[PDB]
Amino acid sequence: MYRNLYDTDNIIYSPEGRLYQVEYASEAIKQGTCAVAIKSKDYVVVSGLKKCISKLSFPQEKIFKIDDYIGISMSGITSDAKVLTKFMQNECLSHKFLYNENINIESLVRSVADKYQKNTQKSSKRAFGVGLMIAAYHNEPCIFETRPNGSYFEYDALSFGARSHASKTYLEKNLHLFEECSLEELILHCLKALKCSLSSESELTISNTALAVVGKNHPWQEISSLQLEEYLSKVK
C-alpha cells in the first residue's frame, strides 16, 4: 500500500503482493494506439491504427512481418519492440536453417514470452513494456498476446489500451466472426472495431490504418493503398 518504498526496483514486492515496477510497464501499452485482430475459421486479419505526430510527418508503422506466415503488431514503446521484432525474426530464420519445416507458432511465442521473464528477475534489467499481437497461421489460425510478464492467451479478438473498453464490448457481443468464411466481411468487422473505438472529431481511416491478412493460402500480405480505401474503408 505504498508508492514510494516498494517502487524503485523490480525486486521489491508490495505488501499486498503486487509488483509495482512491472505493473507500471504494463500500463505503458495503454498509452499507445489501438490494434484489433480477428480470427476466422480459415483466416486471421490484423488492423492497426497508426499515429501521426504532426501534419508533415508520416504515420509510423505498427504492423510488422516476422516470417512468411507470422506477423505482429506492437503496442507501447517502439524501441523495445524493435528488440522483440528482431528476436522473433531470428528465431523463425534459424528454424528454417537448422531444420526445414516452419517454426511452430506455439514454440515461437514460448521463446518470446521467456524473454520477458528473463528481464523481470534481475535487478539491472527492466521489464519490456510492450504488448505483442502475435497472429499467425501454421496449421490452424492462431492469435497470441504477450504481456510484460510471461503469459500466453490464444485469443479470438482483442484491442490494445487506446480505446480497448470501447472495442472489447464490440467484439464480446460478436460471435459470428468464426462462421464468417468470406474474407471480405471479416476485414470489414476488423475495420469496424477501429471505427467504433476512435477519438471524437478525428478522421476515420485516411489511408493511415495498417491492415494485413494471413491465412490458409494467404501469406503475410500487406494491404496496399489502392485496395482498402476503395471499398474496405468506404462501407460506412
Binding site: 537448422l98 531444420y99 526445414n100 519445416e101 511452430n104 506455439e106 514454440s107 514460448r110 496449421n139 490452424e140
Partner: protein, 224 residues
C-alpha cells in the same frame, strides 16, 4: 571418437503401401570377431519414426540419447496432434549435428538412417513412452532419410547403408515396385539379406525386422 572399433552391420529400409520396413541383423563385430551377437540396432525415437545404426556402435548410443531427449521435450508441449516432430525434422537435426562435428576433428562415425511416417492424418494423440487393421499411405508421407558420416543427407524410396549398399541395393534397384504388399516386402528383404550373409564377413543371422505401419512400431525376430 577415433577409429571404428565396434563395427556394426548395415540395415535395409524400404517402403510400401502399409508403411516403412527397416530390417537388420543383431551382430556387432569387435575388430575381427563377433563379440556381441544379441544387440539391437533399430532404435525407436518416436511413435511414428525409427532410426537405424551402422558402423560404430558405441558412438551410436550417444546419438540415440540425443534424439530420445528431443522426443520427451517435444512431448512436453503436445497440445495438438499436429505438433509432433515429423521424421523430416528428425532427419534435419541429425544432418545438422553431423555437419557440426564435420567442422571439427571428431566425426562420430555412423551411417544413420531415419525413417518414418511424414504425416499426421492418423489418430495418435495419446503417446505412451513405456508399455486394428493397417492403412494405405500416398507414398509421399513416408520419409526415409540417410545421413553419412561426412554429413551427406538425402531421401529416397529405398535406402540401403553400409556393406549392403553394394549388394542389397543392386538387387533392390531393379526388383522394388511401388506400393508393394506386406508379404512381398519381407520376401525381398529376406532374399537380399541372404546374399549379405554369404558375401560379408561382419554379418550373420538374427534379423530384426521392424515395420512402421500406420498403427505403431512393431518388432520381430526371424532366422531366414
Amino acid at each position: 571418437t577415433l577409429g571404428p572399433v565396434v563395427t556394426g552391420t548395415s540395415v535395409i529400409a524400404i517402403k510400401y503401401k502399409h508403411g516403412i520396413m527397416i530390417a537388420a541383423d543383431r551382430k556387432a563385430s569387435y575388430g575381427s570377431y563377433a563379440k556381441f551377437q544379441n544387440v539391437e540396432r533399430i532404435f525407436k525415437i518416436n511413435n511414428k519414426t525409427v532410426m537405424g545404426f551402422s558402423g560404430e556402435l558405441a558412438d551410436a548410443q550417444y546419438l540415440h540419447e540425443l534424439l530420445t531427449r528431443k522426443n520427451i521435450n517435444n512431448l512436453s508441449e503436445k497440445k495438438r496432434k499436429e505438433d509432433m516432430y515429423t521424421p523430416q525434422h528428425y532427419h534435419s537435426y541429425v544432418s545438422r549435428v553431423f555437419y557440426v562435428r564435420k567442422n571439427r576433428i571428431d566425426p562420430l562415425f555412423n551411417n544413420i538412417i531415419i525413417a518414418g511416417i511424414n504425416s499426421q492424418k492418423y489418430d495418435n494423440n495419446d503417446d505412451n513412452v513405456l508399455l486394428e487393421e493397417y492403412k494405405e499411405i500416398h507414398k509421399d508421407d513416408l520419409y526415409i532419410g540417410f545421413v553419412d558420416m561426412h554429413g551427406t543427407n538425402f531421401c529416397d524410396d529405398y535406402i540401403t547403408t553400409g556393406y549392403a549398399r553394394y549388394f542389397a541395393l543392386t538387387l533392390l534397384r531393379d526388383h522394388y515396385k511401388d506400393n508393394m504388399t506386406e508379404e512381398e516386402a519381407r520376401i525381398l528383404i529376406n532374399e537380399c539379406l541372404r546374399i549379405l550373409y554369404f558375401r560379408d564377413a561382419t554379418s550373420s543371422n538374427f534379423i530384426q525386422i521392424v515395420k512402421v505401419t500406420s498403427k505403431g512400431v512393431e518388432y520381430e525376430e526371424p532366422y531366414i
